[PDB]
């Protein structure tokens, strides 16, 4: 876990009383699949 | 002049007294302070412009007095009132999360946040 | 008598040793002042009173020692 | 880099390594702390802070 | 006689006192050098502080020295 | 007589103790010089005359001890 | 006779104490050198002449104590 990942997890936790706007909610959870590659060859996508 | 900024907001982008929670404990900047680079830990932050005082709850970030008297504070999220009961509910969950569980480390971060909440 | 007169002049000398500590003590207060003001230039207006206070208190312990020296010298 | 609202120029920038942070000419007009691993943290911190901007 | 011997002995004891003052002066100056090296710029404010700190530390040393002189000379 | 002559020699031995503190002091000024200069690489042109001054003053205390030793030694 | 000669020997013993300060002194300079050099790296070439100067002065204080000892011896 990277330093900014460390901060990230904290920020996400920090978004907990409710009052939480959409931009907060998007900033808290996002969907993406990092597609790792080798040389062409592709270790198949897995959620970021 | 103080700079306080978030990715999604800008808060103060000097300002009389700023009290900051850092790797080096807590650091205070008042007028000119000598130039520092300090990583801000998960935090409770106070900014005072005159006697008027504003209290911020901060997710950690970076602090840098620039040698041109620009206190660059950058952090992911700052109002302390907004953060403040739902968080208590979460804290129960976070204890549960530590029990089962990088996920272990994440739950440890949740414990750090739990401490950070206790200050509030 | 020779023994008593000797004792006054000797005893005075012994007392003088205590003062060495105070010399170091004063310096320590000043060192902290210099470093402190260095770390935040605007801390000075609060800190400079504290520094003079610290000097005075450290000096006071020295004073008590020095009093004992002068008492042995002169009575 | 979105040069104008009617133009767009592809642009690049260099992200500064932890090695870069270490030997940066002025690094004495900032108070580094040896005990803190501010390079290994700051590298990471600017890796993201810059990258997010590039994406934006 | 014993008293005259005692004048010389006593004087010697007072000379010991000086060691502390020597250390004291150095401590003020060490802080000066550190402070200046930290700021490049605190120096003009700090310089009168440093002189003051030297003087007061030295003063305790002077007291040791004068007691020695009184014992030497009589 | 013998006792007084003896006393001068004893007193000379005793006097050396004062110097030790100045010794430690000199080292401290140079240590500070090295540490400051290692932090800046370049403060040195400002710092160096200050450093010489501090050295001289610390040294001067040791000198006072030494001359008092000479007053006792030579008579 | 006995007392004066005795006093010279005793005083000589006392004289060694002054040297102890120099002993600490030399070390403090070298410690500073090692710390400075490990912190900066590159300062060393300017700093090494300065370090030798500081060493010489620290040793010298002990030497003065020693020379008074030699007079007593």
UniProtKB/Swiss-Prot annotation, chain A:
Q: What is its main location?
A: mitochondrion
One annotated Gene Ontology cellular component of this protein: mitochondrial inner membrane
Q: Does the keyword Membrane apply?
A: yes
Print the keywords alphabetically. Answer: ATP synthesis, CF(1), Hydrogen ion transport, Ion transport, Membrane, Mitochondrion, Mitochondrion inner membrane, Phosphoprotein, Transport
Q: One Pfam family from the UniProt entry? A: ATP-synt_Eps
Q: Biological process GO terms, please?
A: proton motive force-driven ATP synthesis; proton motive force-driven mitochondrial ATP synthesis
Which InterPro entries does the UniProt record give? ATP_synth_F1_esu_mt, ATP_synth_F1_esu_sf_mt
Tell me where in or outside the cell this protein is found: Mitochondrion; Mitochondrion inner membrane
Entry keyword annotation includes Nucleotidyltransferase: no
List the molecular function annotations (GO) for this entry.
Answer: proton-transporting ATP synthase activity, rotational mechanism
Q: Which family does it belong to?
A: Belongs to the eukaryotic ATPase epsilon family.
Q: Assembly state and interactors?
A: F-type ATPases have 2 components, CF(1) - the catalytic core - and CF(0) - the membrane proton channel. CF(1) has five subunits: alpha(3), beta(3), gamma(1), delta(1), epsilon(1). CF(0) has three main subunits: a, b and c.
What role does this protein play?
Answer: Mitochondrial membrane ATP synthase (F(1)F(0) ATP synthase or Complex V) produces ATP from ADP in the presence of a proton gradient across the membrane which is generated by electron transport complexes of the respiratory chain. F-type ATPases consist of two structural domains, F(1) - containing the extramembraneous catalytic core, and F(0) - containing the membrane proton channel, linked together by a central stalk and a peripheral stalk. During catalysis, ATP synthesis in the catalytic domain of F(1) is coupled via a rotary mechanism of the central stalk subunits to proton translocation.
**Misc. comment:** Present with 4280 molecules/cell in log phase SD medium.
The entry's protein name is ATP synthase subunit epsilon, mitochondrial
Swiss-Prot record, chain B:
User: Which keywords does this chain's UniProt record carry?
Assistant: ATP synthesis, CF(1), Hydrogen ion transport, Ion transport, Membrane, Mitochondrion, Mitochondrion inner membrane, Transit peptide, Transport
The principal location of this protein is mitochondrion
Q: What are the subcellular locations of this protein?
A: Mitochondrion; Mitochondrion inner membrane
Q: Which domain of life is it from?
A: Eukaryota
What GO terms fall under cellular component here?
mitochondrial inner membrane; mitochondrion; proton-transporting ATP synthase complex
Instruction: List residues traversing the bilayer.
Output: none
GO terms, molecular function: proton-transporting ATP synthase activity, rotational mechanism
Q: Which GO terms are recorded in the biological process aspect for this UniProt protein?
A: proton motive force-driven ATP synthesis
Q: Which family does it belong to?
A: Belongs to the ATPase epsilon chain family.
- Describe the protein's quaternary organization and the partners it interacts with: F-type ATPases have 2 components, CF(1) - the catalytic core - and CF(0) - the membrane proton channel. CF(1) has five subunits: alpha(3), beta(3), gamma(1), delta(1), epsilon(1). CF(0) has three main subunits: a, b and c.
Q: What does this protein do?
A: Mitochondrial membrane ATP synthase (F(1)F(0) ATP synthase or Complex V) produces ATP from ADP in the presence of a proton gradient across the membrane which is generated by electron transport complexes of the respiratory chain. F-type ATPases consist of two structural domains, F(1) - containing the extramembraneous catalytic core, and F(0) - containing the membrane proton channel, linked together by a central stalk and a peripheral stalk. During catalysis, ATP turnover in the catalytic domain of F(1) is coupled via a rotary mechanism of the central stalk subunits to proton translocation.
Instruction: Spell out the protein name for this chain.
Output: ATP synthase subunit delta, mitochondrial
Task: Give the gene name.
Answer: ATP16
UniProtKB/Swiss-Prot annotation, chain D:
The superkingdom of the source organism is Eukaryota
- Where is it located? Mitochondrion; Mitochondrion inner membrane
Hey, which family's this protein in? Belongs to the ATPase gamma chain family.
Its quaternary structure? F-type ATPases have 2 components, CF(1) - the catalytic core - and CF(0) - the membrane proton channel. CF(1) has five subunits: alpha(3), beta(3), gamma(1), delta(1), epsilon(1). CF(0) has three main subunits: a, b and c.
What biological function has been recorded for the protein in this entry?
Mitochondrial membrane ATP synthase (F(1)F(0) ATP synthase or Complex V) produces ATP from ADP in the presence of a proton gradient across the membrane which is generated by electron transport complexes of the respiratory chain. F-type ATPases consist of two structural domains, F(1) - containing the extramembraneous catalytic core, and F(0) - containing the membrane proton channel, linked together by a central stalk and a peripheral stalk. During catalysis, ATP synthesis in the catalytic domain of F(1) is coupled via a rotary mechanism of the central stalk subunits to proton translocation.
Q: What else is known?
A: Present with 28100 molecules/cell in log phase SD medium. PubMed:12898710 reports two tandemly repeated copies of ATP3 (ATP3a and ATP3b) on the right arm of chromosome II in several laboratory strains, including S288c. This has not been confirmed by the yeast genome sequencing project.
- Put simply, this protein is called ATP synthase subunit gamma, mitochondrial
Query: What are the top taxonomic ranks of the organism?
Result: Eukaryota, Fungi, Dikarya, Ascomycota, Saccharomycotina
Q: Which gene encodes it?
A: ATP3
